[PDB]
Design a protein around this ligand. Structure first.
Ligand SMILES: [Cl-]
Ligand SMILES: [Cl-]
Lengths: 201, 201
């Protein structure tokens, strides 16, 4: 029902780091909300492990990270021992306890979803993966870079774009003077609808 | 409404390679159905370009690839010139023309969706990306490898798993004799719920 461009619903809820008021807690930065169906599940253990190891990577992009599970806070803190010990890491982000299902109803939640939330609290990507298959975390960082650049500049990122790669002038932008103004590096109209420009940063 | 574990609805429809009866056309292999909102759009041009370049990669995994757009077949064939010329590639897969919206209603279709379909015609992953952001195609191949392995073996793939990496005994499998039987390479119970085993292939 929740979809891309909708506002990520606010909530107040207990976490392994205390009460989180989502919109306040995010403030200015981008957000990632990772859902886990249960505590003490194996793929999720490796996922959180890896999310902890990429803390520098998210902070450097001004991204704040939450995890969400129905199990209570005291359970999350036992699991954080498991994750720390087995994944050789330190969990350094909040795990929400949704023991009343307050957040789970709002985000329309065997599959596990991930929501990327922008500074205006808009949902910018929903990724749902089945229990069988852990996530690739390079892909969420890449997607965040693309999202940040395309909010600041009138570009889209092509297939197999990585931060720094050549981009595409967004098709809606047709005014020649505004293009000249926004892209001093210029562009190659390899087709009239395919205007390739250096990443303008 | 369409979801993971549902059957990918069958359809007969015109394509740049002729009439496609999806279930027949897939037959035994895995499927990827890539949706594009329109022909002659820039990100999609790079996406199809790249899908064409990975034909060896999909075939080697016994995966068949379709693209879907509302524009008519004669339009797809003009666009295939554009894609061939600008992407330095040869489009070698069918692009469905959905000029009656027959397929678009069935798959519940600015965002563009991708459906991974197994040999039993079940939907195994839905990925929806916004217009701003081209896909990473390493990630769809990785996901396919994980899906194929977890259908054949009672394992899940951990975070940042690549074909060959160590996996996890699926949590539902508890019978010790059946574990011994299925995993002669053995496993490390680093926790009772986190049983790491070599990729059994
Ligand atoms: Cl690249
Ligand atoms: Cl790996």
């Amino acid at each position: 029902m929740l979809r891309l461009g909708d506002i990520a619903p606010d909530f107040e809820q207990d976490s392994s780091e205390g009460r989180i008021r989502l919109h306040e807690w995010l403030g200015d930065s981008w957000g990632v909300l990772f859902s886990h169906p249960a505590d003490f599940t194996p793929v999720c253990t490796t996922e959180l492990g890896f999310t902890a190891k990429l803390k520098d990577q998210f902070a450097q992009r001004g991204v704040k990270v939450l995890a969400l599970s129905v199990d209570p806070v005291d359970s999350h803190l036992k699991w954080i021992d498991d994750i720390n010990e087995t994944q050789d890491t330190r969990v350094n982000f909040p795990i929400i306890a949704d023991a009343d299902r307050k957040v789970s109803e709002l985000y329309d939640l065997t599959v596990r979803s991930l929501f990327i939330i922008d500074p205006n609290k808009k949902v910018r990507l929903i990724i749902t993966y089945p229990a069988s298959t852990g996530r690739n975390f390079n892909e969420i960082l890449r997607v965040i870079d693309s999202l940040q650049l395309t909010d600041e500049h009138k570009v889209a990122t092509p297939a197999n774009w990585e931060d720094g790669d050549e981009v595409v002038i967004v098709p809606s932008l047709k005014d020649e003077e505004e293009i000249k103004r926004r892209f001093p590096k210029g562009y190659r109209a390899v087709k009239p609808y395919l205007r390739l420009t250096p990443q303008p940063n």
